[PDB]
Amino acid sequence: ASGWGITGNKGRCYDFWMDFSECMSHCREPKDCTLLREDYLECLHHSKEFQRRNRIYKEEQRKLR
Amino acid sequence: MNTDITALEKAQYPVVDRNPAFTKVVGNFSTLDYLRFSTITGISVTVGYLSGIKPGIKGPSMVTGGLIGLMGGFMYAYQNSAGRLMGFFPNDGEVASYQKR
Amino acid sequence: MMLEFAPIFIYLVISLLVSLILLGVPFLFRFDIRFYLVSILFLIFDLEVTFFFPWAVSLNKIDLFGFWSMMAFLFILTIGFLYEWKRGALDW
Amino acid sequence: LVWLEAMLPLGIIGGMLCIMGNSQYYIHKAYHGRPKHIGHDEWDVAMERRDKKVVEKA
Amino acid sequence: PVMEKLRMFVAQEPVVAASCLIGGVGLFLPAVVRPILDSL
Amino acid sequence: AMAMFLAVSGAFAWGMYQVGQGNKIRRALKEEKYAARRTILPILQAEEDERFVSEWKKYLEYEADVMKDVPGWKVGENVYNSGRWMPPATGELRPDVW
Amino acid sequence: MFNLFLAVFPEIFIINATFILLIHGVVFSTSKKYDYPPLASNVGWLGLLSVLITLLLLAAGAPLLTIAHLFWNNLFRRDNFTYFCQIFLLLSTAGTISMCFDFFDQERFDAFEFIVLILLSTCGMLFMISAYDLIAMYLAIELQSLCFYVIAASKRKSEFSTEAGLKYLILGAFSSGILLFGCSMIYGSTGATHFDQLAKILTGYEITGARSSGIFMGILFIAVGFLFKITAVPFHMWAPDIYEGSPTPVTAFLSIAPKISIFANILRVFIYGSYGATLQQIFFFCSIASMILGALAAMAQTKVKRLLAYSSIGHVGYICIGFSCGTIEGIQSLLIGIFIYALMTMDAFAIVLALRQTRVKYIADLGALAKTNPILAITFSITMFSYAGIPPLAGFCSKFYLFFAALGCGAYFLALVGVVTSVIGCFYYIRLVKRMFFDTPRTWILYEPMDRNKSLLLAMTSFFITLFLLYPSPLFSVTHQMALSLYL
Amino acid sequence: PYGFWTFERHNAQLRWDPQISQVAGRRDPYDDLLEDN
Amino acid sequence: MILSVLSSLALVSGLMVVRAKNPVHSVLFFILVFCDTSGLLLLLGLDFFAMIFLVVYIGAIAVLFLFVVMMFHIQIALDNESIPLLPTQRNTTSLRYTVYAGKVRSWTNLETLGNLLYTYYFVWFLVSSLILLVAMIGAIVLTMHRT
Amino acid sequence: YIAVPAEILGIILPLLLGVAFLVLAERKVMAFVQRRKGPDVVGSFGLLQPLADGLKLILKEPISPSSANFFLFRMAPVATFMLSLVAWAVVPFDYGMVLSDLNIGLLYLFAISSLGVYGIIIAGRSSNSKYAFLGALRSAAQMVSYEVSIGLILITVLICVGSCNLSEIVMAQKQIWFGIPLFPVLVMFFISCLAETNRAPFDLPYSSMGFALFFLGEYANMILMSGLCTLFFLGGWLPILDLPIFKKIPGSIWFSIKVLFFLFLYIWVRAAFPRYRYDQLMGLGWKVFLPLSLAWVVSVSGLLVTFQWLP
Amino acid sequence: MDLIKYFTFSMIIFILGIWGILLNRRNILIMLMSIELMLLAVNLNFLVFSVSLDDMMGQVFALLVLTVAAAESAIGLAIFVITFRVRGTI
Ligand SMILES: CCCCCCCCCCCCCCCCCC(=O)O[C@@H](COC(=O)CCCCCCCCCCCCCCC)COP(=O)(O)OCC[N+](C)(C)C
Ligand SMILES: CCCCCCCCCCCCCCCCCCCC(=O)O[C@H](COC(=O)CCCCCCCCCCCCCC)COP(=O)(O)OCCN
């Protein structure tokens, strides 16, 4: 969110945060910037990508047996 | 370092020299600014003198109170002069002086 | 970039082993308050030295603002040290 | 003349100091073929990894 | 006065006077000399 | 005496000047080293891109085969609604330090 | 560049004045010419002068508080709420300093570092109110906590003061750890620490899809830490013991100043942290329990300071009623209650310090006070009735408007608990008035007359308490203006 | 209020970050590679 | 591997700290807790913070606690935010994109911190300075008995 | 990768031999200063004396004073010996002859030096002698009080370099050595190292191995501080400032020569001056060296910033 | 999975600190070392989160909280020292 990176460059998730915050700067209803909020929160934790990979692994294991 | 002098609440009075230098603000002191400076300094000196009699240090307490009063009064006068120049306080004389400039 | 600590860890292990060998060579055949004040002063000035290390290295990027910020920090701790001095906590 | 007899142990110390530094220059070179590089940054580390992979490939 | 109190302080506190002098020089250089060089 | 102060204070001035003059040379050398890196970056990045796209083709070929049966799937669907491409995440919170 | 610091002259002045006072005291206390003068009153008077001058600097420079707001954005945020909160805090600090002058002379408290530490705590609270980040809020909280830990154990030879200081430090460090863990859990879940960012990231996803465990846990931990700070039950672990064991001039300051700033922080957390009305439930339970426990515990107290501590807990619950109902008229009731409670507490502690020169410890000690000093008894009875909430006095307005705010949100259970607690409080407050006027003790205790500072403070506060209902408009106007400015 | 995040007082990072966008420590890695020419 | 043992030893050390009879042994295990935490930080690449933990925690605070214990009495006494990734890294390790643009001029943990500790967030730095000054002042007034 | 223990042995064993011969060199120089001859009968010029002393100390049939927990008492010499030896993993002897090239080497040295306080404290407590406990408690405070000044001097050195890498601090002195401008800083650093090691005027003070490990650790600390004094101020392995014709001499020889020179200063200062008192050690270290070190930090930083001579 | 382990270790350290504050109510020193354990756990949380999110707002905060922890140690030990003197016991 701050944009100060660990290695002296721009933060990894700073661009997503600036897209989300720019969306919220001209949208009084927060239900239309949800798609950018989800992107920012997914850049922080990679929950969706990890879930997809876990689903692929589980499907592979089920086919194994 | 990057700096920004813009304020959240805009100035309600005409703005002359939006970002004044220290020397120019000090050179903008009016009679009222000197009056409040001297008042604060004298009050501080008197309080220091009166409060230091019982311990037994009149001169040292006088000087300590005088330093406090000088610092406080100077910063108060600088605050008023800068606000007048920047347009946050009624700058009746400032606009008159800098219009003919 | 952090690969240079494994030699240090192996050095620690081998120094441990050689110290144990050295110990095994002959086997085969009231309260004072100033001691607390000195520790307090050490803690404060050790934190101050800690805060110097980022400043000294990164003194080329920051310029005339970080320098004066560090100067204000040192001024505050110098007032503290002067209070430490005149109160007799530095005497033994 | 006569003061050189106190420089013998003090020169043995210098010999030990020299051998400690020279023991890690011909042992580290022995199993790498290259002297140690000072100032390892992640660019140098990654570029060494790329060197190892390209040498292994061809 | 000043030239006598300062002499008394410096005589009995040489190390403090020396440290204060060198620190004052090190603070004087970036406060009075740096802006002068900024004009050039 | 007095000459001791003169020699120490002149050393502190001339030596600091020489220290600055050597820091200039060190900065120039470091800048040359950095400038030699920005001229070979494109080819290294090109090789990395080729390797990554080949491995990504392999990974998509793998994931398409394993779960062909599942009705709801997209095979390499971006998880970002914006559509930006991001590197595949790893279970290491600092991989390039060891 | 120098004009960017126009937003921090009130803090720069007080910091530099504290430094000058410290240098002056340490130089002249350890002096041979003046035979080690006990210059505690001198430093106290000069510190009061410094507080008044920084009040003049802060109050006059009202349009200049938003100057360079972009440059100072990440550090602190100054607005109308901060302006009035800081002015009130400086006024309370000046009042406490005025009260504690007589303590330095009769009891011979010659340590001048007490005033320096009070000024440093004041600086910490000034930085606390304007803090707009988790980092700044935590740092200011820790600074004031340390300044209070040191002065709580100022009476080194006293058994109570050392134990009170130890308990205070342990409790405060534990609460700070809980709050700091909450801040860490919030930062690790949203990636942001600034209040603007933390509001934009939480205002949309109002637990609409799922409950974020990290965010919920961090919010709960921050709320729990803040509740320890204000001593709302069951987070009142050692608050009565700390209040009793602490020196009376010290207890006067901790009963007023640490509450204004912490309540400001809690408000500036509610502006963004309203995550599913989670805090509204926590503060609801805490307020009910606080009122009930204060009412049921202050009736079993025979000492004046323990009764004051339990009164403080009960009034904290009454104020948290306003937190439980999140609305402009709820925050306004909260701020009015804070103001009135602070003034009543200053009045009561000035009265206690007036009688502390004769070592008053029990309520029965002030038995024949209506005969020896028949005007001090009237003033103390007025203060007690104001605590009770009798209609004609100023203490009724705060409880009235708080109950109105509680009924506005529709919480009828809060109103009944408040009414019962008010009845119990009024009973144990008029119990004190019974002792002064109606009892005829065999042995009397004669007190020595107070000094000018406390006499003037008592006169002004007693005229405020009795005659507040006649002209209450300015307080309501400023409070409504502050409540609206929390968001716009 | 209805959309208080849209207010100017609550949008300060949108005006400060562009001013500090070129400061070292916040730059796009490819930004400095093209500032030579 | 290294993480598991370096965490297990720290847990055992902390358990011994909170459940020790002789406070000297408690302080000694209190030192080992930070000795393990420094290694854990080193595993993260925060070399500066591990060294500061050695310097500050077990260099100043631990020494102070040891002084107080010794000379005085030695008396007796998950799936919500970041779902974990299952061990599927045979293909994931190959899917490692490296951007050489961020490596041409890389900062260290020290200068990265010092770039913004003293200019963009200097007020908090001065507040910590004031906290240190408060500690210095409070050390004397509580504990001082001359002559 | 099985050659790392070879490097560690090659840096540890010659260190111990150098420590023994440093004890011999001390006992020989302190004799030639006093117009006598040191140990000479045992060896050709006394060179075999350390081996004889080591064997005689080993063959003593000593008893362990187990009137304690016996764990802390036995491990305290080990705890100090490990810390004394581990600081040598970062000191560079020439361009590429460093075992571990840390990028935080300066602060790592500060940490290693600061944790060396525990060994003496644990030794003082574990021994039941109350006076030994008090002596260890005083020595720890002295070491701490001068560690502060050592750190502040390290900050002054770091300002002119801009990096914590020890191998780059030497490369930063290719123009001139830092001992020429910062000569008072060099003198203060040498005096602080004298007081840090409990040696020379700042020297206020069991059986078999424990005392041997303490003795070896203290002398290894002496060698390490002599190496640091030339690593930061005398240019490390860099040749003499001028006359670049002797460049055939390896760089590791110059580091050795400068370290031997600083060891000779150690012995000379021990032989030439009496011992301070504790009430004067603490005063000297808290009122004469702290202000001077802080003022030198301020002066160097202000002068470098003013003329833009920063790294 | 490494973030889970890093958070679990610090959570256990925090729990141990709370236990030490609660269980060792009789002894004062344990009630200080447990607070320091809690501060250590929170600092580890901040550093791990800063590394995980690639943000420098956790490292600055860890450095600034080190000062608070040290100052709390100093004040607490001074208060304990004066406390033992008065009552003669812990
Ligand atoms: C400039 C930056 C700030 C520098 C100081 C920062 C730290 C603050 C330290 C404050 C405490 C020390 C303040 C100075 C103490 C010395 C006071 C002094 O110089 O006056 C002396 C003596 O000097 C004098 O002549 C009196 C000076 C006081 C009156 C001066 C006019 C009032 C000045 C106040 C306003 C201006 C501020 C001070 C000047 C900048 C005191 O007088 P006595 O010794 O009591 O008189 C001797 C006779 N008999 C003992 C019998 C009583
Ligand atoms: C190539 C190699 C060259 C040699 C390298 C090694 C150098 C050291 C060689 C040995 C030197 C003698 C060592 C003796 C060790 C014990 C001496 C300690 C005595 C001491 O500390 O003096 C104190 C004061 O002097 C002091 O403070 C002493 C420290 C002074 C440092 C110099 C600071 C001068 C700054 C001037 C700067 C001007 C130029 C730059 C602008 C006490 O003395 P006291 O009894 O009076 O008590 C102070 C009351 N005030």
E-strand ranges in A1-65 read: none
Q: Give me E7's structure tokens.
A: 């002499």
3-class SS of residue A1: coil
Side chain identity at residue J276, one-letter code: Y
| Among E27, E29, E36, E38, the residue to mutate for chain C (most C Cβ within 10 A) | E27
For chain A, the straight-line distance linking the first and the last C-alpha, in angstroms and rounded, comes to 45
Residue K4 CB contacts under 8 Å (≥ 6 apart), including other chains: I78, I82, I84
Residues G317 and G287 sit within 8 Å (Cβ to Cβ): yes
Q: Report the first-to-last Cα separation within chain G, whole angstroms.
A: 29
Under a CB-based contact definition with an 8 Å cutoff, are residues A7 and I102 in contact?
Answer: yes
Alpha-carbon span B47 to B42, nearest angstrom = 8
**Cα–Cα separations (whole angstroms), residue F15 to F28, G180, J184, J230:** 20, 49, 13, 17
User: 3-state SS of J223-282?
Assistant: HHHHHHHHHHCCCCCCCCCCCCCCCCCCHHHHHHHHHHHHHHHHHHHHHHCCCCCHHHHH
Task: Output the six-digit token pair for I60.
Answer: 């100043």
- Give whole-number Cα distances, A35 to A20, A53, I9, in Å: 9, 21, 44
Q: Of the candidates F55, F93, F94, which has its C-beta nearest I95's C-beta?
A: F55
Report how far residue J182's alpha carbon sits from residue J158's, in angstroms, rounded to the nearest whole number. 12
User: Do residues J241 and J176 lie in contact, with contact meaning Cβ atoms separated by under 8 Å?
Assistant: yes
CA distances from G330 to G326, G484, J58 (A): 6, 11, 83
Of all residues in chain G, the one with the smallest CA distance to K85 is: G157
Q: Which of C36, C40, C42 is the best substitution to test chain K (most K C-beta atoms within 10 A)?
A: C40
CB spacing of B76 vs G64 below 8 angstroms: no
Q: Which residues contact I34 (CB under 8 A, 6 or more apart)?
A: I53, I54, I57, I58, I62, K40
Q: Are K34 and K14 in contact (CB under 8 A)?
A: no
The CA-CA-CA angle for residues K16, K17, K19, to 5°, reads 65
User: Quick one: tokens of G308?
Assistant: 């004051």
Atom of ligand 2 nearest to the CA of F8: 39
Q: Radius of gyration over alpha carbons of chain B, in Å?
A: 18
Q: Give dist(CA H17, CA J209) in Å, integer.
A: 63
Q: Where are the alpha helices (DSSP H) in G276-411?
A: 278-298, 304-324, 328-355, 369-372, 376-388, 395-408
Q: For J28-65, what is the HEC assignment?
A: HHHHHHCCCCCCCCCCCCCCCHHHHHHHHHHCCCCCCC
Residues framing ligand 2 (Cβ under 6 A): E 13-15, 18, 22; F 8-9, 12; J 179, 184, 186-188, 190-191, 194, 201, 265, 269, 273, 284, 288, 292
What is the SS3 assignment for A4?
strand
Q: Which chains touch I (3 or more CB pairs under 8 A)?
A: A, C, D, F, G, H, J, K
CB atoms near residue G322 (< 10 Å):
29
* Distance, CA of G487 to CA of G267 (rounded, Å): 11
Q: If phi over 0 gives left and psi between -120 and 50 gives alpha, with beta otherwise, what is residue G231? A: left
Write out the two tokens for G430: 């008029």
Cβ(G178)–Cβ(G228) under 8 Å? Answer: yes
Nearest CA to G186 among K57, A4, A39? K57
| Chains G+J touching (3+ CB pairs under 8 Å) | no
Whole-angstrom Cα distance, residue G434 to residue G18?
45
CA distance J33 to J268: 8
Please tell me the distance from the alpha carbon of residue I145 to that of residue G383, in angstroms, as a whole number: 42
CB contact burial J71-105 (16+ within 10 A = b; e otherwise): ebbbbbbbbbbbbbbbbbbbbbbbbbbbbbbbbbb
Question: Which two tokens mark A40?
Answer: 């920012």
Rounded Cα distance between G421 and G318, Å, is 10
Q: How far is CA B47 from CA B69, G106, J2, J284, in A?
A: 10, 21, 79, 41
Which atom of ligand 1 lies closest to the CA of B64? 10
Q: How many domains does chain K have?
A: 1
DSSP secondary structure, H6-30, as one string:
GSSTT--HHHHTTTTTTSTTSS-HH
- How far out from the chain centre does Cα I139 lie? 24
Determine the Cα–Cα distance for residues G285 and G270; give it in Å rounded to an integer. Answer: 17
Ligand that comes closest to the CA of residue E17: 2
Distance G18 CA to ligand 1 centre (A): 18
Dig out the tokens for G306 from the structure.
């323990």
CA distance G97 to G46: 10
Nearest C-alpha in E relative to J295: E23
Q: Domain range spanning residue K10?
A: 2-87
Gap between the Cα atoms of I2 and I39, Å rounded:
10
DSSP code per residue over I57-77: IIIIIHHHHHHHHHHHT----
CB contact at 8 A, G88 and G260: yes
Counting DSSP H helices and E strands in chain G, the numbers are 21, 0
- One-letter amino acid at J104 equals I
Find chain G residues with C-beta within 8 A of C73's C-beta: none
Q: CA of H9 to nearest chain B CA: how many angstroms apart? A: 7
Q: Are J144 and I63 in contact (CB under 8 A)?
A: yes
| Host H or E run for residue E28 | helix E14-28
Name residues whose C-beta falls within 8 Å of residue G42's C-beta, 6 or more positions apart in sequence. B51, B52, B54, B55, B57, B61, G112
CA distances from G4 to D16, G67, G69, G132, G150 (A): 61, 7, 9, 18, 34
Candidates J306, B77, C33, J26; CA nearest to G57 is: B77
Q: Which of J172, J176, J307 is nearest residue F26 as measured by Cβ atoms? A: J172
Q: Provide the 8-state DSSP code for G365.
A: G
Amino acid at F71: P
Is the separation of the CB atoms in G295 and G314 below 8 Å?
A: yes
Class of domain I2-142: mainly alpha
Of J208, J207, J196, J219, the C-alpha closest to J27 is J219
Tell me which of J173, J183, J187, J192 to substitute to probe ligand 2's pocket, judged by most ligand atoms within 8 Å of the beta carbon.
J187
Q: The tokens 């950095």 sit on which residue?
A: F34
> Which residue's structure tokens are 């004067």?
J280
Inter-residue long-range contacts of G368-372, CB under 8 Å, 24+ positions, other chains counted: G368/G436, G368/G439, G368/G440, G368/G441, G368/G444, G368/G445, G369/G436, G369/G447, G370/G436, G370/G437, G371/G444, G372/G444, G372/G446, G372/G447
| Alpha carbons A34 and A20: distance in angstroms, whole number | 8
Report the residue count for chain D.
Answer: 58
Q: Do J3 and D27 touch (CB under 8 A)?
A: yes
CA distance J181 to B77: 46
Q: Do H9 and B6 touch, CB atoms closer than 8 A? A: no
Phi then psi for G303, rounded to 5 degrees?
-100, 150
CA–CA dist A28, H4 (Å, integer): 7
Measured between beta carbons, which residues in chain D are less than 8 angstroms from residue C3? 40, 45
State how far the Cα of G24 lies from the Cα of G18, in Å rounded to an integer.
Answer: 10
The count of CB pairs under 8 A between chains F and H is 3
With b for 16 or more beta-carbon neighbours within 10 A and e for fewer, the G45-80 pattern comes to: bbbbbbbbbbbbbbebbbbbbbbbbbbbbbbbbbbb
Residue type, position C40, single letter = I
Residue nearest to atom 25 of ligand 1 (CA): B59
CA atoms within 13 A on the CB side of J22: 31
J55 phi and psi angles, rounded to 5 deg: -65, -40
How many A from CA of J146 to the centre of ligand 2?
A: 14
Please tell me which of the candidates F66, F82, F89 has its beta carbon nearest to residue A49.
F89
Token code pair at residue G15: 């910091």
Pair G332, G405: CB distance under 8 Å: yes
Amino acid at G339: F
3 state SS of G362: strand
DSSP J59-101: TT------SS-SSHHHHHHHHHHHHHHHGGGS--SSTT--S--
CA distance C64 to C59: 9
Resolution in A: 3.1
* Cβ G226 vs Cβ G270: under 8 Å: no
Rounded-to-integer distance, Cα G113 and Cα I92, Å: 62
What is the dihedral sign for C-alpha J6, J7, J12, J17? positive
Contact K76, K32 (CB under 8 A): yes
- Tokens 């100067």 locate to C71
G54 with G16: CB under 8 angstroms?
no
Q: Is the dihedral of CA G360, G364, G369, G371 positive or negative?
A: negative
Contacts of G387 (CB under 8 A, 6+ apart): G311, G315, G344, G348, G395, G425, G429
Question: For residues C44 and I132, is the Cβ–Cβ distance under 8 A?
Answer: yes
DSSP string, G394-439: THHHHHHHHHHHHHHTT-HHHHHHHHHHHHHHHHHHHHHHHHHHT-
Specify the length of chain J in residues: 311
Question: Does residue D9 have a cis peptide bond before it, meaning omega lies within 30 degrees of 0?
Answer: no
Closest-approach residue (CA) in chain J for I53: J111
Cβ(G176)–Cβ(G229) below 8 Å: no
Rounded CA gap, K86 and G159, in Å?
Answer: 6
SS3 of residue G133 by DSSP: strand
Q: How far is CA B68 from CA B36, B56, B81, G48, G98, in A?
A: 14, 20, 20, 12, 19
Q: Three-state DSSP class for G276?
A: coil
Strand partners, G362: G303
Q: Which of residues 11-50 of D touch I (CB under 8 A)?
A: 41-43, 46
Q: Which helix (H) or strand (E) covers residue J205, if one does?
A: none
Q: Which of K21, K45, K83 shows the shortest C-beta gap to G188?
A: K45
**C-alpha span between G382 and G374 (Å, rounded):** 13
The CATH H-level superfamily of C5-87 is: NADH:ubiquinone/plastoquinone oxidoreductase, chain 3 (1.20.58.1610)
Distance CA G169, CA G149 (A): 6
Does the CA dihedral J114-J120-J121-J123 come out positive or negative? positive
Give the residue from C41, I70, I38 showing the smallest Cα distance to J112: I38
Buried b (16+ CB within 10 A) or exposed e, B39-63: ebbebbbebbbebbeebbbeebbbb
Q: What's the CA angle centered on J166, arms J165 and J170, to 5 degrees?
A: 115
CA atoms within a 13 Å half-sphere pointing along the CA-CB vector of G449: 5
Q: What secondary structure letter does DSSP report for E29? A: I
- Rg of chain K in Å (alpha carbons): 16
What is the least distance, in Å, from the CA of I103 to any CA of chain C? 11
Closest ligand 2 atom to residue E14 Cα is: 50
Cβ A10 vs Cβ H29: under 8 Å? yes
Q: Evaluate whether F97 touches D45 at the Cβ level (below 8 Å).
A: no
Q: Which residues pair with C21 in a beta bridge?
A: none
